[PDB]
Amino acid sequence: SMSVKKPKRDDSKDLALCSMILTEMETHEDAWPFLLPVNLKLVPGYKKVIKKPMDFSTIREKLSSGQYPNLETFALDVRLVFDNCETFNEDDSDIGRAGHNMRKYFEKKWTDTFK
């Protein structure tokens, strides 16, 4: 509350560490469904169904340009990518399985880096 603060958690490396995580996600062999925005002209149903499209390149641009206020808003967009994928793709599909694999990969890096 006013003039009563919990001790200051060092957030000075968060930008660099989120960038490293995002590099690792970018270079994963199952990243290919997520590297670029889904083409809303060429994929029937995507525009209407997926209210907030997100992809690694869009996260990378937001990260590079100071559009994440803190590391939690960064994790929200990464998870959005996987939540979108699960909304649109069957679990038993290459892209569906890619999404599960990447989300697992991300959540471990997240925990190991920050928890």
From Swiss-Prot:
Domain of life: Eukaryota
Compartments (UniProt record): Nucleus
Known tissue expression: Expressed at varying levels in several tissues, whereas a smaller transcript was expressed specifically in testis.
Residues in Bromo domain copies: 9-113
Main function: Regulatory subunit of the ATP-dependent BRF-1 and BRF-5 ISWI chromatin remodeling complexes, which form ordered nucleosome arrays on chromatin and facilitate access to DNA during DNA-templated processes such as DNA replication, transcription, and repair. Both complexes regulate the spacing of nucleosomes along the chromatin and have the ability to slide mononucleosomes to the center of a DNA template. The BRF-1 ISWI chromatin remodeling complex has a lower ATP hydrolysis rate than the BRF-5 ISWI chromatin remodeling complex.
Family: Belongs to the WAL family.
Assembly, per entry: Component of the BRF-1 ISWI chromatin remodeling complex, at least composed of SMARCA1 and BAZ2B, which regulates the spacing of histone octamers on the DNA template to facilitate access to DNA. Within the BRF-1 ISWI chromatin remodeling complex interacts with SMARCA1; the interaction is direct. Component of the BRF-5 ISWI chromatin remodeling complex, at least composed of SMARCA5/SNF2H and BAZ2B, which regulates the spacing of histone octamers on the DNA template to facilitate access to DNA.
Name of the protein in question: Bromodomain adjacent to zinc finger domain protein 2B
Organism: Homo sapiens (Human)
Gene name of this polypeptide: BAZ2B
